[PDB]
Amino acid sequence: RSVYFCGSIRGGREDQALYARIVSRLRRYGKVLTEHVADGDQFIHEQNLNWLQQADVVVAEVTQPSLGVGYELGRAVALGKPILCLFRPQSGRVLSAMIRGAADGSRFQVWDYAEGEVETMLDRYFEAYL
Amino acid sequence: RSVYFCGSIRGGREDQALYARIVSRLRRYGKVLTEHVADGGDQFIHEQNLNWLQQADVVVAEVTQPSLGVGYELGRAVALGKPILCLFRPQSGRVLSAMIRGAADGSRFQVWDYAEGEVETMLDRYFEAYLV
Ligand SMILES: CC(C)CCNc1ncnc2c1ncn2[C@@H]1O[C@H](COP(=O)(O)O)[C@@H](O)[C@H]1O
Ligand SMILES: CC(C)CCNc1ncnc2c1ncn2[C@@H]1O[C@H](COP(=O)(O)O)[C@@H](O)[C@H]1O
C-alpha cells in the first residue's frame, strides 16, 4: 500500500517526464511516498530513509545513473524490501553490473522495457506480485 | 587493514586518473579489494564485490561522477556499519547527491570536499586522525 519510487535528480533530469508517468501509474497500486522525484541534505536523507523504512515496495527507474537511486536500492535491499528496477536499453547505456547483478528471485527484479510500455510493465508487475 | 574503493564505471570514466591516484594512496593504509576500478557476468561481479564489502574494514568512495553502483555500494556498506569516507570534487561544477551528502553522520559516514591536487594528503589525514 506504500510505494517508494526512485529516480535520478542530481544525476540528471533527462527522464523527468517519464518519472511523472511512472509516479502517476504507481498511484493506482499504492500511496507514492516520493512524489518529489516527479516534480538541507541532512533533512532530505532522514526524510527519505523514514519513507524507505515504511515502504512496502520499492520501484526504481535505473536508466539515468544516480548516486541517490543506487543508495536507495542498497538501503532497500538491506531492509528486505521487494524491489523492481526499470531499465531502458534503447538509451544506449549499459546498466551498472551492481544493479543488474543484484537481481535475485522475486525479491529484486530488473526489467528491460521500451519507453512507450512503461505503464503496461508496471501493471504487469503489480498484478503478478502485488 | 582492508579497504574497499568505490568509483564510477558504467556511470562514466571521466575521473579515472583520480581513481588511480586514490587507489595508489590507499595502498599505504591497507590492501585495496577493488583495484580494478582504477584500470564473468553481472551476477558474479555483484557477489564478488558484496563479499569484499562485507569483509572490508573501511569504505572509500569517490562520489563526483554519479553512479548507480557506487551509490549501491554505499547503501549496502551503511547498513553493514562500515566506516565510510566519500570524496567529492566541487570544481567539477556538480552538486553532490542529497542522499550522499545527507548520509554524513559522525565518524561512520564522512563526506569530504577536495581540490584535485590535495586528494593524497586528504587520504593521509583521514587515516591518520579521522578513522575510528
Ligand atoms: C525538499 C526537496 C524536495 C528537495 C529536493 N531534494 C530531494 N528531495 C527529495 N528526494 C531527493 C532529493 N534529492 C534526492 N532525492 C532522492 O534521491 C534520489 C535521487 O538521487 P540523485 O539526486 O543523487 O540523482 C531520488 O530517488 C530521491 O528519492
Ligand atoms: C565490461 C565492464 C565495463 C565491466 C565492469 N564490471 C565491473 N567489474 C568490477 N566491478 C564493477 C564493475 N561494474 C561495477 N563495479 C563496481 O560498482 C561500482 C561502479 O558501478 P557503476 O558501473 O554503476 O558506475 C564500482 O565501485 C565497482 O567497484
Description:
The structure is a homodimer. By secondary structure, chain A is α/β, with parallel strands linked by helices. Chain A has one domain: Rossmann fold (3-Layer(aba) Sandwich). The first copy, chain A, is built from 5 helices and 5 strands; from the N terminus they run βαβαβαβαβα. In chain A, strand 3, helix 3 and strand 4 form a beta-alpha-beta unit. The interface between A and B is large, with 40 and 40 residues. One N6-isopentenyl-adenosine-5'-monophosphate sits at the interface of chains B and A. Chain B: Its main location: cytoplasm. Chain B: Its EC number is 3.2.2.-.
Fill in the keyword field for this structure.
130 residues; 5 helices; binds N6-isopentenyl-adenosine-5'-monophosphate; homodimer; alpha/beta; Rossmann fold; 41% helix
Number of strands of chain A: 5
Beta-strand residue fraction of chain A: 15-25%
- SSE series of chain A: EHEHEHEHEH
Largest sheet of chain A: 5 strands, parallel
Which structural category do the helix and sheet elements of chain A fall into? alpha/beta
- Count of discrete alpha- or pi-helical segments spanning 4 or more residues of chain A: 5
Give the N-terminus to C-terminus distance of chain A in angstroms.
Answer: 9 Å
- Quaternary state of this entry equals homodimer
CATH class of chain A: Alpha Beta
The ligands bound in this entry are: N6-isopentenyl-adenosine-5'-monophosphate
Mind telling me which CATH architecture of chain A this is? Answer: 3-Layer(aba) Sandwich
* Helical coverage of chain A, percent range: 40-55%
Could you give a quick summary of the protein structure above?
The structure is a homodimer. In chain A, 41% of the residues lie in helices and 17% in strands.
